[PDB]
Nucleic acid binder design. Structure first.
Ligand SMILES: [Mg+2]
Ligand SMILES: [Mg+2]
Ligand SMILES: [Mg+2]
Ligand SMILES: [Mg+2]
Ligand SMILES: [Mg+2]
Ligand SMILES: [Mg+2]
Ligand SMILES: [Mg+2]
Ligand SMILES: [Mg+2]
Ligand SMILES: [Mg+2]
Ligand SMILES: [Mg+2]
Ligand SMILES: [Mg+2]
Ligand SMILES: [Mg+2]
Ligand SMILES: [Mg+2]
Ligand SMILES: [Mg+2]
Ligand SMILES: [Mg+2]
Ligand SMILES: [Mg+2]
Ligand SMILES: [Mg+2]
Ligand SMILES: [Mg+2]
Ligand SMILES: [Mg+2]
Ligand SMILES: [Mg+2]
Ligand SMILES: [Mg+2]
Lengths: 56, 203, 49, 144, 60, 172
RNA sequence: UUACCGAAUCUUUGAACGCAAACGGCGCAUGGGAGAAAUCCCCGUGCAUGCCAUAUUUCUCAGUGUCG
RNA sequence: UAAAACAUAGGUUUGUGAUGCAUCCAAGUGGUGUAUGUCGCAAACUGAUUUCUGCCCAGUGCUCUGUGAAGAGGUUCACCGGCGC
RNA sequence: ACUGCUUGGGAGUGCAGUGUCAAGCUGGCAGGUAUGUGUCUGCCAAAGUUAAAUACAGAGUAGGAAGACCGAUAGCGAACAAGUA
RNA sequence: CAGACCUGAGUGUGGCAGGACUACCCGCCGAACUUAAGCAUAUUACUAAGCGGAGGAAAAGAAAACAACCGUGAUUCUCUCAGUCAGCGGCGAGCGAAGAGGGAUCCAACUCGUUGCCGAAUCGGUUCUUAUAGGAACUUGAGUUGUGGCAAUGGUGCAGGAAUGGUGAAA
């Protein structure tokens, strides 16, 4: 995000402390990286083969 | 630099978003036991500063503590002897509340060895410190150079001895130099050292 | 001085209710759905002291 | 030596010099300096007149090392100069040189009759020392 | 005991050994870090000790 | 307190003494001599144990702090990184060859600096490394010169007054 | 026989911990024993709570928590 | 010291509707009256019955009716915040 | 800030409680008399480990060396089946 | 809805905790007697008792230290500083240090988090090599809600020693 090499980012909706990611939407909005929140860290999980993914 | 964001997000504890998150938790934490283990810290970045690592044998605990001053446990509130030593309500515990939470936990669970604690939340009645206990006999701990000191018997109950960072705070050891000379190896050590009647062998 | 008897009854030691032979609390029936939407017939069985 | 105590002399004389009447008690007056302003008032006022009170400005955290300015008089500079070196010191000739920090002195008070010149080398000097020291044909040279 | 040390000889079962047969020391010698894990040092330290070995010396 | 006796201030009103009642606060030195041997045995026990190696590692010549002592030149606590550099030694190599290092010292003056680079540079000559396979000023004596004219006091006192009333001469 | 120390032996207890306890009481499970017309009886081992780890062939689950 | 005292019944008075009253506890989603609920509970005084308890509410007791200003700031001054009757 | 303990620590030494709660784009903390301000000096807190020199002031284990000490009402309570009867 | 995760249970499994000791030591707790010729602040004393904890020492320790110097340089200790022309204090009784300095000790220093560059390189378990190697293969098991790296040894063999013991003189 900061290096803005990312060209899309996928914040997960739910997170144990949302604080982990709570800032992230503002940070993509600042680097003007496209981003989307999505329903579950479990789905970013399996999408990455991890059992949960806070982000992708 | 995700820590840098998550660290300054928590520096705004009074911000209405952080004030809301904290609100729901303190609600959520009131309806939980005085000690509660967590699979993860509420504050991953803060726990990790204090030596927590997401590894086997590191475990986190959220230990509640009632706020407000100590009431000294004299019967019927009466106090005997000199008027100075009177006073029930207003004298304060000379011990930290991170200390008391590190000590509640480490005494309930002698299985473990508390590393540090950090403030998590605090409603009107309670403060919550999430402790980072290490389990001395997890193999991951035993074999990691950065942490296996905790395994050594000298730290069995560090917290009860006021060795943890909280227990060094109220113990005055956050000050070197002239602000902690009467305090400095320990208040007790300072006392021996000054109150000894040295007798040089030839005087 | 020394503790007043009004204060000692609050220890509720010697000063507790007896009640070994008490039958239990004398209350109304639990406020069932039946109480709230109908009635429950109970026959009186015996009037105790 | 227990042999020499008059404890040992008056073994047998029942009251050990404390008197038959007016018996040797304990603390016939208070512990230590008790009643310094009462029943021992005549005592401190006679002997320790300034004992009670406060006199001046406080100096919180005094550091005596910065304050360290020990003094040697002109009259005592023979203590430092070698007697052999000091042998011939005409004012118009060569002079023994006397660093005073080396010898542990800081200021140079100009007391008595110096008459043998020396180039005293010291941190401080009296108004009268540098004058006397010059009039003898010597010279203080300031150091630190 | 000489035939149960025989049954449980070998690393694979040594953790499964009856503890009457397991080498009792003191409660502390057993719970203490073993040298196997005591002398562990972080990889940086391991390298910064090879790079500057306690080279022997004398001063004439 | 009857008589001319000085007012006594014998701070012994605490239970330092050991009686039936108290475990006293007392530090006698009865083992002083035994300890003197213990250390003495142990330093000798140590030098035997590390024969080539000097009993004590190389230390810097440092200035003492205050005005009371700045004339004194005590042994320091390890060389500056700048000193070890100038002597050409490597600072993390230095301790392994018996040279104390001290990251905290600053070479505030070129004097203590150069006294030490000479010291390490002198030590590295004396050093024998098995392959893995205090200086100060003095003065003699001299004729007095221009010194005879000037009063050093009004020189000393201007310079003292200059600082002493420096803040009070600004407002005027 | 003495001295020492490696192998063991170490009864009832006791933190005491299977449950009790002014009871040399009583269990459940596991294996043994004797025995006996099985029931009884003795014995060994396990069986406290809390917590950490783990389920290494990844245990079984619970939630109008989140989703799919 | 067995009384003349205490108790006593009887009398009165006070609190109090559970958010209670009295009250224990260092402390708590702790405790006692209260397994109760005014014909109850808690507190006091008097001391069976008969008879009567006059006058005094003066005293005492009980009851009832942060925000501005100045200052460089520390600060200072000002305004609002249970009594008296 | 308030309170409380604490300290030689003094308009606060440390601490605790509660309220309040930073900074890091003239940073922060110390610089032993408060405040605002300007210089300068040392430092870089709120995470962690760490031998030695030190304690053993009613401990232990295994040994050892002693004494200008006591000498059986003394020295440990205990020279003995003494923390025993 | 099947599952998935999150949260939480239940067993199995492998461990630990609890007790003792507690002279010293670390944390809290916390008197009064006494002294002040009374006594409340003070003092006793930040002591005793009380509670909780360690170890063979502990605690402390690597600078948010001192100084104000020609500057020193972790901690502990010690002598001194100093019963102080510090300071506290019904400024009374009383209490009372610190810098520096001599010394002991000291080839004494390091590690995280973070930052940056990477990004599972990690860990656990299984097997394996004569090895629960700092090895190797293998593992979704944990872990990217961040392990770890970078910059700011295990196995087997021989010996000697030391140290303890065993032996051992004259007349
Ligand atoms: Mg006579
Ligand atoms: Mg006499
Ligand atoms: Mg007489
Ligand atoms: Mg007399
Ligand atoms: Mg008389
Ligand atoms: Mg004074
Ligand atoms: Mg049992
Ligand atoms: Mg009566
Ligand atoms: Mg009547
Ligand atoms: Mg009337
Ligand atoms: Mg005090
Ligand atoms: Mg910092
Ligand atoms: Mg005897
Ligand atoms: Mg214990
Ligand atoms: Mg008195
Ligand atoms: Mg005690
Ligand atoms: Mg330690
Ligand atoms: Mg430590
Ligand atoms: Mg130092
Ligand atoms: Mg004191
Ligand atoms: Mg990391």
């Amino acid at each position: 995000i900061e290096k803005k090499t990312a060209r899309l980012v996928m914040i997960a909706n739910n997170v144990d402390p949302i604080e982990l990611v709570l800032w992230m939407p503002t940070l993509c909005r600042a680097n003007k990286v496209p981003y989307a929140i999505v329903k579950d860290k479990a789905r970013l999980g399996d999408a990455v083969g991890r059992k949960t993914a806070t982000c992708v | 630099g995700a820590f840098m964001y998550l660290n300054e997000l928590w520096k705004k504890k009074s911000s209405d978003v952080m004030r809301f998150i904290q609100r729901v938790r303190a609600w959520e934490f009131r309806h939980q036991h005085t000690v509660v283990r967590l699979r993860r810290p509420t504050r991953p970045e803060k726990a990790r500063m204090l030596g927590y690592k997401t590894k086997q044998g590191f475990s986190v605990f959220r230990v509640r503590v009632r706020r407000g001053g100590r009431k000294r446990p004299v019967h019927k509130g009466i106090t005997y002897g000199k008027p100075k030593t009177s006073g029930v309500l207003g004298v304060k515990l000379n011990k930290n509340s991170r200390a008391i939470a590190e000590q509640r936990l480490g005494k309930k669970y002698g299985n473990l060895r508390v590393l540090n604690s950090y403030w998590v939340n605090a409603d009107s009645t309670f403060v919550w410190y999430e402790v980072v206990a290490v389990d001395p006999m997890c193999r991951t701990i035993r074999r990691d150079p950065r942490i296996n000191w905790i395994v050594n018997a000298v730290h069995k109950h560090r917290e009860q001895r006021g060795l943890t960072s909280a227990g060094r705070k109220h113990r005055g050891l956050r000050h070197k130099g002239h602000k902690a000379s009467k305090l400095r190896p320990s208040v007790r050590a300072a006392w021996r050292r000054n109150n000894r009647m040295v007798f040089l062998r030839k005087r | 001085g020394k503790t007043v008897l009004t204060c000692r009854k609050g220890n509720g030691s010697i000063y507790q209710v007896h009640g070994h032979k008490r039958l239990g609390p004398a209350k109304l029936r639990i406020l069932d759905y039946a109480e709230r939407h109908g009635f429950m017939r109970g026959v009186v069985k015996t009037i105790e002291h | 030596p227990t042999r020499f105590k008059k404890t040992r002399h008056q073994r047998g004389s029942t009251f050990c010099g404390y008197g038959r009447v007016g018996k040797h008690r304990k603390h016939p007056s208070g512990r230590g300096n008790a009643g310094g302003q009462h029943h021992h008032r005549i005592n401190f006022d006679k002997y320790h007149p300034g004992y009670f009170g406060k006199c001046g400005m406080n100096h919180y955290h005094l550091k005596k090392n910065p304050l360290w300015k020990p003094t040697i008089n002109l009259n005592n500079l023979a203590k430092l100069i070698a007697k052999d070196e000091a042998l011939k010191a005409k004012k118009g000739e060569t002079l023994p040189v006397v660093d005073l920090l080396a010898n542990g002195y800081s200021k140079l008070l100009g007391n008595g009759h110096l008459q043998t010149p020396c180039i005293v080398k010291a941190r401080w000097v009296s108004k009268l020392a540098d004058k006397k020291i010059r009039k003898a044909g010597g010279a203080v040279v300031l150091q630190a | 005991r000489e035939s149960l040390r025989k049954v449980y000889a070998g690393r694979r079962l040594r953790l499964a050994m009856p503890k009457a047969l397991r080498p009792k020391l003191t409660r502390r010698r057993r719970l203490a870090l073993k040298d196997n894990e005591k002398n562990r040092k972080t990889r940086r330290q391991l390298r910064m000790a090879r790079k500057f070995p306690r080279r022997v010396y004398a001063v004439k | 307190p009857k008589g001319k006796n000085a007012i006594p201030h014998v701070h012994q009103r605490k239970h330092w003494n050991p009686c039936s009642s108290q475990k006293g606060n007392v530090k006698v030195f009865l083992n002083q001599p035994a300890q003197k041997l213990r250390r003495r045995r142990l330093r000798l026990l140590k030098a035997k144990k590390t024969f080539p190696r000097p009993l004590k590692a190389l230390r810097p010549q440092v200035n003492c702090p205050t005005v009371r002592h700045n004339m004194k030149k005590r042994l320091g606590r390890g060389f500056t990184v700048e000193e070890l550099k100038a002597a050409g030694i490597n600072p993390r190599f230095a301790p392994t060859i018996g040279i104390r290092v001290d990251r905290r010292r600053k070479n505030k003056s070129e004097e203590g600096m150069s006294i030490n680079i000479q010291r390490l540079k002198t030590y590295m000559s004396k050093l024998v490394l098995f392959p893995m396979s205090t200086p100060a000023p003095e003065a003699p004596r001299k004729v007095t010169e221009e010194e005879r004219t000037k009063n050093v006091y009004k020189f000393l006192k201007k310079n003292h007054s200059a600082v002493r009333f420096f803040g009070i001469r600004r407002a005027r």
